[PDB]
């Protein structure tokens, strides 16, 4: 046993739409325990030192902020900040926990604010967050009245970060992170809303990824899909001969308008492009006195409109679509 | 869904020795939902009408007796007795529930009294009851301070009877019945004590049955094995050419002394024969004014020392054995 | 048992590179016997009546032509033509067997002539023909000195047509048609040359299709890939919202230059675009011979408004030195 | 690849009743190639040096004897005897090949002579020989007109010895030894006759062993079952607390009358106890020729105190009419 998922097994056992998941999940998580550990056991020792127990104040509406009415002792706060610092890098965020500002590589808060007006109200919805990273967005979804959030992301570090935040939240059982790829899930048709965050361009079969997402949604459910794109019409699709912005294991970069056609082909309805930006809009940069060149490593220093390989600079599009059928329970 | 096993999934999820069982159990119980229903849906409608809620008094020490300080209304008691009567036949017992005496085909109470002095104290033990029928013995095991009892018996009727008694007990979660054969279990090595009640003579491979039981026990665990036997020494073993006492699907009927050697061969220790009787010792008979011949149908009316087929009349032996190794947690 | 593949089991048993295929093929063909029969048992009764025995003359070099020195009697020829006619429609060909001109609907011979100059010589090569139809091209490949041709095509009718031609060839064991999808093959790495003709645009995962093909080739083996394409550069890729040219179950239509990049990504070498043409083809009661899938006011477009069909042929090499 | 079973794949491919075996056999033999090799690759190099080609004279009727009209040169015979000697120990036999008397440790010929009168005539029968050792009896079965003999025995050495004899027979394809346990076979119902010799008492589930054997027989086929037994009636069955006659991994030793009931329960017909004998057999430096497993003060008992070994032979029929 590296990490016990007992609490998740208990939750899905008591949920009639998720109980079928017990037919495949336990073997997958048993196998994960015996796979390459890496740093997970060292990280787990730090997680175990983070103080247990409910905080006094939680904001998951306007930010992700945890605080006590009575602040912590200088010693306990130094130790807590030091434990959290060992889990670098923190990508999604940012977080404020007992005065400590976890200053993340991404402004997930700003992207959340720009997307939220375009999505169906989360009140009482079950949500699957695919490529959920450390789980930032699941807190924001509970903040909007989500009943249940399940995150899936295969990173050991993301599971530790999530469990550290969940522990500082007092063990909130409404959000969970499973170390899985979406391809490991059976056909649940169980969630009201599915988020796919930055996964499509890593998949050799982009249409199989879109069908896998459709298969997790109830009748009339909603998909929010974010991926890297290029500018162009319905027939613009980049596939790089080697690496894209220094990344290996990259396949399809459709235009947003191309991606809209792909979603319609596999059977989604009411497809809208709701946001498109250069990725730097939502990135933070370490920009101190020691900084050499300010340009990210993945951009050409001679022309920051291009990657080091000479492709167009990264752009992120966010689409919202509907699975066919009437959405039940309002 | 015919019957939801959520509560069992929750229990084994929170138990580190039983959690591995989630790797095979859920698919088996999913398949059971879709197998031939028979009368289970009609029976379930009666179970659902049995009154919910804790009784005032429970004796599971000296009997299995349930009672309220304030007795039930004449109407509610007639309805309850009528519901319970639809689940005939009640084999293991007997039971007394709110004044209603469930007068069973077997005196499981007397056999329990004769065996109890020969078994390791049940206090804080986990127990697997193989061939558990309606689950009578699991109540008696909790009565002796067992922490946990799991019953396995593939009969639809036995699951209903057990759930009716469990409901009248106020939903006691320390005992459960799974509709499984012992051959469906993986190698758990999780129980302190295993009971095998009247299963061995139904198994084509009696040694595989004994190894399956050894595989469910912890180091130093205890087996109590009951089966049908013949008189004789270590080389006396009946295999009938067709039926035995009118029963189809019957294989090996060793002498008790033969069975002791079989247990030693597959690796058990400290094997003791603790009880041997004609089966009629522990049977009840309907013996009223209308009775034609008093002899059970399976006995020869011309010679009640023999079956109708001419084999020796049924005898039951009870053996107690130890899995090798030191038993941990005292 | 609808059809006995004993002869193919025997062939791959005696071949070192194909024997591993026996680990999965027999259960797949057992399951195929038990699937929806349709007309296959009736068709098989016609195949059983087709005359057995070697013909005197075989041309598989310039055509697919079978003849006896001494021609058949008018009765035997009427019966044989009647049996062959029961397997309509014949798409790939044409075939001429003992004077009977089989009623083929495509000129597979012209396609073959346009391909042939661009491929590595077939002498002593083993060839996998994916989407092989009734197997016309496998005969032409044997005609060019191929050691062995295996065709992959799930149609009941294609297997009957193939076995009818094979029987009239005297049971030639150097060509075989298996009713399988390419996705059912394991990683054989057994063939010198693989043809994928008209398959890629039917596959939901086109890169998994290219990897499937690479996985059937030996070191230094050759892929010939023909598919429907659009004009444009390396980022031109059409996916329809529903049908393309009135075809259902269609996915990716890259430009040939896009397809070249896809093949390089998957690990192919020396990728060449070898041929590219706008497709043409009727009933004589039709006003014109424009397919129904073309826009009648602009035949450069489909009725759905996309660019009209174009076929490209690419040739590529799996990395490594090609042995014997 | 340690040993190529291509010839067996080809044989069962061309046999209607055995072709279904291709659904499971190839993966099992692939896994066997990759299991613990031991000496098998060294042994195979000796097998490869044994001279190929048909001998002039074969007796498989009265013995197993191979000879040329023109004998081998003293050099060729020394080399061949040296190669055969590398596969020690030879248990079943004896064998005489080109004048060389193979050093067999059992008189399988006497066993064969005692069995033969009790079995249905072998002419044109297919036979499964379970626990066949180096395959001595399969030669004798062919000698009696058996169409086909398949031996089932997991020993590396047994397969080498068999293939050495088969090679000296000129590659006779009517007998084959597969390195499998009986539990690995599917339900073939393909053989006219099944032999199970010295296997039952090694099986933890003896009734599953009897059902396994019934499952390999055609309608009306015959089982010959030989095992170790005790004296007694239908309820006499020995199971040891640990070893029987110093053998580990042993389970049930029924009386022959008990075994007859077991066969009837499992659904066999016309069950006959045909033969029953107390077994005998040394090094000449031994005080006596009592096996070490016998009690020296009472050789009617094992050293463990059980009854001494006895062998019984039973013959039974699967229900149904036996075709051709």
Automatic annotation (TrEMBL), chains C, D:
Enzyme type, top EC level: transferase
UniProt keyword list: Transferase, tRNA processing
InterPro entries: CmoB (IPR010017), Mo5U34_MeTrfas-like (IPR027555), SAM-dependent_MTases_sf (IPR029063)
This protein's name: tRNA U34 carboxymethyltransferase
Gene3D superfamilies (UniProt xref): Vaccinia Virus protein VP39
HAMAP family in the cross-refs: tRNA_carboxymethyltr_CmoB
Recorded catalytic activity of this chain's protein: carboxy-S-adenosyl-L-methionine + 5-hydroxyuridine(34) in tRNA = 5-carboxymethoxyuridine(34) in tRNA + S-adenosyl-L-homocysteine + H(+)
UniProt family annotation: Belongs to the class I-like SAM-binding methyltransferase superfamily. CmoB family.
Purpose of the protein: Catalyzes carboxymethyl transfer from carboxy-S-adenosyl-L-methionine (Cx-SAM) to 5-hydroxyuridine (ho5U) to form 5-carboxymethoxyuridine (cmo5U) at position 34 in tRNAs.
Keyword tRNA processing set for record: yes
Quaternary structure and partners: Homotetramer.
Organism this protein belongs to: Vibrio vulnificus
EC number per UniProt: 2.5.1.-
Residues noted as binding carboxy-S-adenosyl-L-methionine in the record, renumbered to the chain: 92, 106, 111, 131, 153-155, 182-183, 197, 201, 311
Gene Ontology terms for molecular function: methyltransferase activity; transferase activity, transferring alkyl or aryl (other than methyl) groups
Keyword Nucleotide-binding: no
Record-level GO BP terms: tRNA wobble uridine modification
């Amino acid at each position: 046993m590296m990490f016990n998922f007992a609490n998740f097994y208990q939750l899905i056992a008591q949920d009639t739409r998720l109980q079928p998941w017990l037919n495949v999940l336990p073997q997958q998580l048993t196998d994960w325990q015996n796979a390459e550990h890496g740093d997970f056991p060292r990280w787990l020792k730090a997680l175990n030192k983070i103080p247990e127990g409910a905080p006094d104040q939680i904001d998951i509406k306007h930010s992700v902020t945890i605080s006590n009415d009575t602040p912590f002792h200088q010693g306990e706060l130094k130790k807590l900040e030091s434990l959290l610092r060992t889990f670098h890098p923190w990508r999604k965020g940012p977080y404020t926990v007992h005065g400590i500002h976890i200053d993340t590589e991404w402004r997930s808060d700003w992207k959340w604010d720009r997307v939220l007006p375009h999505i169906s109200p989360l009140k009482n919805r079950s949500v699957l967050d695919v490529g959920c990273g450390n789980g930032y967005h699941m807190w924001r979804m509970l903040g909007e009245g989500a009943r249940l959030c399940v995150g899936i992301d295969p990173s050991h570090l993301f599971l530790i970060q999530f469990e550290a935040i969940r522990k500082l939240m007092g063990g909130d059982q409404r959000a969970h992170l499973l170390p899985l790829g979406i391809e490991q899930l059976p056909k649940l048709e169980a969630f009201d809303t599915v988020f796919s965050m930055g996964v499509l361009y890593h998949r050799r079969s982009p249409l199989d990824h879109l069908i896998q997402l459709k298969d997790q949604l109830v009748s009339g459910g909603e998909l929010i899909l974010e991926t890297l794109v290029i500018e162009g019409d319905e027939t613009a699709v980049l596939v790089p001969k080697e690496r894209y912005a220094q990344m290996r294991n990259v396949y399809f970069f459709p235009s947003a308008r191309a991606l809209k056609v792909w979603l319609e082909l596999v059977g989604f309805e009411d497809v809208r492009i709701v946001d498109e930006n250069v990725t730097s809009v939502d990135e933070q940069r370490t920009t101190n006195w020691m900084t050499h060149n300010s340009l990210p490593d993945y951009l050409d220093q001679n022309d920051p409109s291009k990657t080091v390989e000479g492709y167009p600079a990264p752009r992120r599009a966010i689409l919202v679509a509907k699975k066919p059928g009437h959405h039940h329970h309002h």
